[PDB]
Structures are given as C-alpha cells and as structure tokens.
Amino acid sequence: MFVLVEMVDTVRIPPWQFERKLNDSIAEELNKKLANKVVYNVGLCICLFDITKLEDAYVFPGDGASHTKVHFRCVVFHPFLDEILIGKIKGCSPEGVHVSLGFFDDILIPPESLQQPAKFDEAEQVWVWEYETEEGAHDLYMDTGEEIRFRVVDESFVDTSPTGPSSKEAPYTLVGSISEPGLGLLSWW
Amino acid sequence: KRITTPYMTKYERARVLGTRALQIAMCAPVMVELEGETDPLLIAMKELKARKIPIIIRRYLPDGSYEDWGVDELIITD
Amino acid sequence: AAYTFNIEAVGFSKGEKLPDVVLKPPPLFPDTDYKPVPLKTGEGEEYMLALKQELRETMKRMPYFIETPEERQDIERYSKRYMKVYKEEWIPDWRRLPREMMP
Amino acid sequence: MEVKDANSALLSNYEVFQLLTDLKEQRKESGKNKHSSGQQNLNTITYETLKYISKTPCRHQSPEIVREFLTALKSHKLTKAEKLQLLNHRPVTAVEIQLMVEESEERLTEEQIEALLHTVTSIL
Amino acid sequence: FGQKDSVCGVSECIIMGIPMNIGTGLFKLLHKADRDPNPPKRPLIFDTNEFHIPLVT
C-alpha cells in the first residue's frame, strides 16, 4: 500500500546551513516540507526515500539562499483499488463506520457496502449485524475499535483550498467495502 | 576549453561582492579570519582579495551554451 | 442620491415608483412555466432507438475505431485480460489514397 | 514541485519498516526549535506510521526472507499486486486468499490454494 | 489581434520588476556547496524485474 513517487522540486537551502553537506540538508528540508501532507494526485507522503539526481545550486537575485533542483523519490500511502487492509475503528455514524488506519484517519464504509443481513440501527450510534443462530441483532461495532479487515473500492481527491475571497473537508477521502465473505472484524473469521 | 575572457569584469565583481555580502549579512560562515570588521561588504571584499569566495560564475553565451568559471580562477584587478 | 444622468430623461415624471432594490441575486435555474412536449413513440420510432444503441456497440468493435492505448496503469489484474480484446486490422486501399499515407 | 511518475514501484511494508527504523537511528539528537511546524509533522507521521507497521506481520522479516518468498512464489501464476498482499498480511487460512486473489475459485484449485497456504506459512 | 509582447526588453523589465539582461544580469551565479551529484540509491528489495515475470501470455 506504499509506492515510490518520482518527484522534482526546488529546495531553498538557507545560507546558515552551508557548513553542512548538501545531501543531508536537502533530505532534511524535504522532510520538513513533504511529511504528513497530501499531495493532490498521488496521496499521502510519509517520508523521503532517496535523492537520485541533484542539479546545480543557483543563487537567485535578491536572496542569498541557494536554490537547487532535486530529483527524488518518496514513499506514499496510496492503496490501489481492490486492496485489503486492517485497521482500528474510531467510531460509528449515521453515514457509516469511520475506520482509522493508524496514521491515516478518513476511511469511510458506506451502509450500502456493509454485510447484507443487517444494515440499520435502532436510533443507536453503533452499527450492528444479525446472524440467526448466535448473536442475533446484538452484534456490534465497538467504539474501542478492535481491528477489522476491509477492502478499498473507491478513492477521491478534492482540492481543499479557501474557496472565496481571502488574504475543512479531508483532501484524501478513501471509501472501502466490507461486504465480501471473510471480511469484517478479525474475530469473525 | 573555455573561450571567454579570463578577467573578471566589473559587473561580475559587483554582483559577486553583492551576493557574498548578502550571504555574510545572513548567518553564512566567513571563509577568512575577520578582524572586527562589521559591515559585510568589507568582509566580502577581504574574501575577494584573498580568493576564497564560494561562487561559480556561469557565463551564458547567447546561443545557449555556457561556461563555468570559479571566482578563485579569474584574474581580478582594480 | 442624485445621478449623473437625469431621471426625467429616462421617465418618472411623477418621480415615484422607482424599480425596487434587489437584495439576493436571482437563482441559477429560474422556474419555467412550460414543460417539454412528451416524446414520440411507436413501432417505428422505437426501432431507431435500438438501432442507435447497436451503432455504438458495433462501431466500438469495428477496426475503424482507432483505440487509444492504456496509460500509466497502476496494477495489472487478472480481471484486466477480460477487458482487453484483440481485433484484426483493416487494410486501406492504397490506390484511392495518396502516396504519403504509406507508413 | 512536479510529479514525473505517480506510480513508479510497489513497496512491501518491510522496506518501509526498515526505512523508518533507519530514520529513527539518526533522529532526536537535536530537538525541535519551534521555528516551523514541519518537524512536528515529520515526527508525528514517522512515529505513528512505524507504530502501525509494528503490529503488522511485516516485523521479524529480512531481505533474504522476501527473496526466498518471491522465489518460492514465482512458480504459481500470480500477479505483482497479489504477491504484495500475500507478503504483507501473512494469510493463515483459506478464506482470505479467496479475497486477496481475484477469481480464486476459477484460477486456483483447492489443492493449489492449500499449497499456497503451505508456501506462505513455510517461509514467513 | 492578441499580439504577445515579450518582457525581454529593458524598459518592460524595469516596469514588471524583474532584473534586466544588461549589466549585472547577463550571467547567473552558482553556489559551490559541498555536494555529491548522483548519490548511491537505496536498493529495492521487493520490486525488481527478475522476480516479476508477467502473468499474461
């Protein structure tokens, strides 16, 4: 569920960091800028992998800081379509089962992709599932969040920006399915 | 080989002293042992006289080809 | 307040009943009084509706449809080879076509 | 910034585990300066990503484990993305390889599925 | 007409606030940092070409 993404970038190296070798400073400044942020079309950048080509360090007029163009690769949480993950449950909602995946928070399960013998709550928060012989209608998705196993079937990019005149929705929403046989909580199979 | 002139022109001298004095005005490491000089342009000129400025001049010929000259290997003059 | 243009040259010799000051802009889709006339159906008009859908499903399989190639695909799947259909290639009459058409 | 390749290579979670482990080895010798919130973001995402990976079955693995795993798994007519999930999740029963492999009941015979379970449990 | 006007000339470089090409703008400066171009790459363990002969015939 992790990929390499070859990216190019201009890294402004400030001039108090000239005593230090440039490769360590490029890595430090790129980790200070890409970590824990969602790039619009590739996903969530975890950390830098390596620097693969490091061009010449220009000095622009009006600033003493040396800019350089860096060819690098970065690990990115971007799970491809139809992929199985395991993660904790944060909480239940009328819109569905909000699934945390450790670091990443917005994995939503719609009601249309829950397991079919029960799809509805009795005006209670926690979502339920009914089997006839044991645990009829009292099985539940606990808010303490035992680990479930789901299957991502949709991902969506919104370009979260201040719309309107200037100078909170998630930019990386991920929608999965659980309805296949064998999925759900790990306690059920 | 490099075909351009080996003398540092007055424009190259002006901008190398400018960019170096701007970097010394921020917290860059000074390459020469300064002696209580405060104005960073004087420190840049003392670096230029002793040939220690870490700048490479890239001279662009107008077709697109370029030439890299170190500041320590130009022939500076008055 | 007074205007640059004289209101009297526009009208309003009484000076009253000025057009009202609009608070909210009008909505994007105004409600229309009228609706479309319902469609024509029949045993002849329905055959065109099926033939037009047959034209799309046929001409996408004909060799004249130049396929666009797949690009930057993420993973290869076993459900991918169900999608891919090889198709025989037509040959142009080179006598009717000019010389620069030859590859 | 500009992306030359959105999908360049798929990664096992062991490579990311080893990467965050080597990143932990040289970090925290000089603390954060409160000059930008970039170090806060790096510390939180590195910590929490490593904490999530440290409960996956990709701990206790090695390079040569993955080498012999792909070596033994090479002869089974599977894709890249299926071998990736089989390496990451360590399946132990047959109900979930039906999930992780597409058209499991049509490509893979039940004896081949059992041999696949044995191949997975024999290496990891 | 839609006639596109360059900002290569001196006077419009003064107007648009960009440094002009005559004088001390004809060249470009480079910093001589202690750098290492083309550094060694971290090895890929999982995705190499030798372990992933494709599935389709």
Add this chain to the structure above:
Amino acid sequence: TQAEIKLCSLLLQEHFGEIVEKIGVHLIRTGSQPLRVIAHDTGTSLDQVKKALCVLVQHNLVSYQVHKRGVVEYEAQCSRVLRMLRYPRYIYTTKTLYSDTGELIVEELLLNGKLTMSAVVKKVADRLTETMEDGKTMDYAEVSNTFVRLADTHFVQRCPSVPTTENSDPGPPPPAPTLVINEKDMYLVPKLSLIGKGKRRRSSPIPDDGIYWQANLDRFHQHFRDQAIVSAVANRMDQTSSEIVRTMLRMSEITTSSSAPFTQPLSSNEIFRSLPVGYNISKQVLDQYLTLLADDPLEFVGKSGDSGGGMYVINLHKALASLATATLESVVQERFGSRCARIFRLVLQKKHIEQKQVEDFAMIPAKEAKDMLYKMLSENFMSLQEIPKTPDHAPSRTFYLYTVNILSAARMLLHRCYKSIANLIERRQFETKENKRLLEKSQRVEAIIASMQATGAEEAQLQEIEEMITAPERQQLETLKRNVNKLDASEIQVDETIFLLESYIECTMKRQ
C-alpha cells in the same frame, strides 16, 4: 459554427476515437492544411496522423486535392460529419421501403464507408445467417437483386473512380491519384456470376476491384423532403389529396434536380394512370383536387401550363418555406405559450406593424402584449426597423416597425438545435461516466449468467447474483438505462427539426 465544431467533436469522439477526433476537429476548425502541419499544429506522432487521415478519408469525411509544387492539402466536410447523426433514420427508411436485406446493405455501407459490391453482398449473406435457422443458408443472388434495386432507385451510388493511368500520363506516379467523378457509371452495377453461402461462424481475383459503393445521402434527403411535404398535405387537406401529392412526387423523383426552384410539369392524364389501383376515383374529381390545391394560399402546387388539359407542377421552395415557418412558429408556441404565438403569426403575416396595431388586432391587453414582444426581441425571433425622421437616428423621433424575417430566425433556430443535441450528448456521457463502475459490475454479472447458460445452468446461480449486492443498485441500473434511452431518443428526434430547417437554409442559397 462553434456549436457545429463542438457537436462534430462529440460525434467523432463517439464513433471513431480520440486520436482521430483531434485530427478531425483540427481539419474542421482551420481548414485546408497539408500533411506536415496537421502533425505540427496538433503535436501527435506522424503515424497516428496517417492512420487518422486514412480512417477519415475512408468514410468520405475528408477530401483532398493537388496544388502547386505537388502538395496534398486535406479538407474536412463539416456537413458530412453532421450527417453521421441521422444514421438510424437512414437505416429505418431503407427498412421501410425495402426488405431486411436492403436494411443490412445500407447498414454495412454506412458503417464501413466504402465497400465493393462483392464484399457487401458477402457480409449481408453472412449476417443474415443469425436471423435464420434450420439448415437454410442465405445466397448471394437475392441479396444482389435487392442491391440492384437500391442502385436503380439511386439510394446507393458508386464512389468517384480512379483514372486509367495507362491512358492518363504514363510515367512517374503523382503524389495523389486525382480521383474524378464520372456521371456515367454511377448506377451501372458490375455483373456477378459468383454465388455462394454464408458461414454460420463456426470458428473451426476480384472482378469489381476498385469499384466502391457509398450511400448516396442526397437521395435520402430528397426522400425525406418528399415525406415532409406529403405529411404536410396529409395534415391539411385529406388522405386522397395526400396520395395524389405522393404520386406527383414519385413521378418527380427521377426527373429533376434535388435543388431546383420548380420541378418538371406533369400532365393530369399521367397523374391519373400512375395512381395505385386501390382508389376508386375519376378524372373529373382529380381535376377538382388539383384545381382546389391550386386554390390554396399555401400554394404547394402551381398551374404553370395549359396544354394537354390539366398541367400541374409541385412547389419546392414555397413548400419548404411553409414547413420552416411552421417549425419556427411551433417553437415559439411551445416556449412562450399560445398568446405569444398569436403575436408571432400576426407580425409574420402583416409584414410590418407597430405596438398599438398589435394591441388592436390581437385582442391582447397592454402589459401582456409588449411583454411578449420584448421577450421575442430578446431571443432574435423578431427584428425592429426604425424608420428615421432625422439622420440622428434618435429613439425619441422615429417609428419602430416590428418585423419577422424567416431566414435569420431559421438560422438562429438551427444554431440552437445543434447546441441542444450537443448538450444531450454531454448529459448521456456524464451519466455513463459517473456510473461506469456499476456498469462494469453489471457487465461482469451478465458475463457470469451468459457463460454456461445453455449447458448446466443451475437455478442456484440465478439466486447468487440476486444474493449479490448488485440487487440494491439494480434500481440505479434501471434509472440509468431509462435515462440513456430517453436521451438517445431525444437526440434522434431533434434531427426532424434540424432537417426541416437545414433544407430551407439550403434552398434559399444560390452558390454563385
């Protein structure tokens, strides 16, 4: 013609692909360009330019000429791309006038663009095998007998032919073969003795080579104009008068131009003989019919003759003007209401009018008359005149005459119809794109039901697709299917307005 370029982009992208619609849109948009600048101004590879130009010139979508210094400058026909939309009406009218064999002939022609006679009769004999069963194979001869009946009726014609290079400049080959259209051998079919049977698709040297056939779309347009005037008379006067008008157009079929201000005159003595024998009519009642249709102020017919007794012509341009005027008033009636259509017909017939005159004639009060006048001015249906007193042209010192000009309003209505069909195609493609995931999942489950359906289809798997989660969204699949069906049906039925407008704008032009 920005609406035309958008609609041609949508139709080429639907019926040929992407890297061919780029070339088609560029050739429509800029015009006559040689081959290297189609490559450079688009940015694609040269081989794709070659394949795109060959698949366009196959369907007779681009033409090409020879110029100075030996260059080949291509040129696309915007009208021929726009007539790709009427293909189901063409296939329905050939099924109307003929058999299913004549349907499949025109189908193979409009799909392949150019085929030989042997190839098209082979493909028709192949494709009629699925329609039959129990050992009976289709043969080539009865297909060829319908093909020559089409060729006699001029629905199908021959492509412009290559010149004989042994007679035309023997030596080096020119860059382009310089095709020329021969008026002689358009409808001379090549004779065929080769007969055979169609394969049933079991999965287990040409005499007419170079002679290619294309569908003659102008004959279809003439037939459609005939049906339009026939239904106009059938809605105005009577069925018998309509059959007489149909017989006059049938006798005017093979003897006049498709673009002529007045057709051949007809003697009533052969109007009487040409009627189908189901009608109990005399000569004198036919004379009454013709002289009472000449009494019509709509004037579909004219006298234009006295010798031989009853001499009668049928009108073309006045009839198309009547039909375009009916379309232009129908759209006003349905858009604004009946009380505005009254005002439109009033400003139509009295050629010039003022506001007080409208309020007097129309029995429509103030603040409802001028409202509808100004709504029709804001939609380019109704022009002002402004006869000036002084040359200052001031509004305070002049008279404003309302005027309906049929030509500019018909061009405006055509421009609206093109953008209307473009918007319907946009909405269809948007719904298919937003539901393509459920569409492909339905494709999967119908492929599951499709495989081993004839052999060993247990009833349990029929429930297992219903047990599958596609069953909550079968409601959404039915909604998508009825939406796509309604949008395709409206995309078909706007063409009836498009043709009636395009015939009028075509016939009011001289091309000198």
